[PDB]
Design a protein around this ligand. Sequence first.
Ligand SMILES: C[C@@H](Oc1cc(-c2cc(-c3cc(CN(C)C)cs3)cnc2N)ccc1C(N)=O)c1ccccc1C(F)(F)F
Length: 253
Amino acid sequence: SRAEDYEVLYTIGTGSYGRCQKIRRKSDGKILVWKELDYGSMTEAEKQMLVSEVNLLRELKHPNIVRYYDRIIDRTNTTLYIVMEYCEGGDLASVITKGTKERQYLDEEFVLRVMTQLTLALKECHRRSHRDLKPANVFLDGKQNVKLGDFGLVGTPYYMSPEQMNRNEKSDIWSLGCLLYELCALMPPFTAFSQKELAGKIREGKFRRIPYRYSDELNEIITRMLNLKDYHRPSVEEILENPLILEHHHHHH
Ligand SMILES: C[C@@H](Oc1cc(-c2cc(-c3cc(CN(C)C)cs3)cnc2N)ccc1C(N)=O)c1ccccc1C(F)(F)F
């Protein structure tokens, strides 16, 4: 459990937060990644909070939750390393953006994967009661698995549920609703330039149908998650009972 145990291959992302690197475990050669965080400029409280958060990541083990492996302390450089599984496919935001650029929609089969495995991510999270559902916090591994990251655990809040927007597990369904709709449409269900305009549209509750390449069945379910009334949204359970969702849409080792 020392930085010396891993070798850095190269950097994937920079912050902000700090830095994310693809690394290799020396004992076996397993490819992982770790988040870098320089805690040198933090008070004692912030550091007790940070330690508080990290103890959480150690608790969740689930095939659709980005897997925590290790936490490494380097008091020399005041650097904290959080080591996790490598998700070779990246985040969903990039996939959506890529989709926007080369003007190519994604396959319904892919949406069904994301819909299925993330609904199971939720179901796990609600049970342990968190993480927030947005493209940036959703990762893909090398095996068509879909994993939820730790974000949440200036910009327009596109995914804000009608009830929040105000003063609930059903609020999460809405957010998931917005995420799949964006995966299909390559754009959020409600767009605007100001939050106030946004708010006005969300209270109206209208949006385009997702593209016609997507089945009425898919459209209907996403549409149901975007229902203005929280109690009309399908629960995690009604989502999974849907005829669209099959075994091969689940995670695989
Ligand atoms: C800050 C960071 O956080 C997370 C990163 C990962 C994660 C990302 C990746 C990526 C692979 C690639 C493709 N590359 C081959 C070109 C782009 S990103 C690989 N393994 C990972 N474990 C997973 C979870 C989190 C998290 N915060 O929970 C993050 C977040 C969003 C987008 C990029 C990053 C980055 F780049 F810093 F890792």
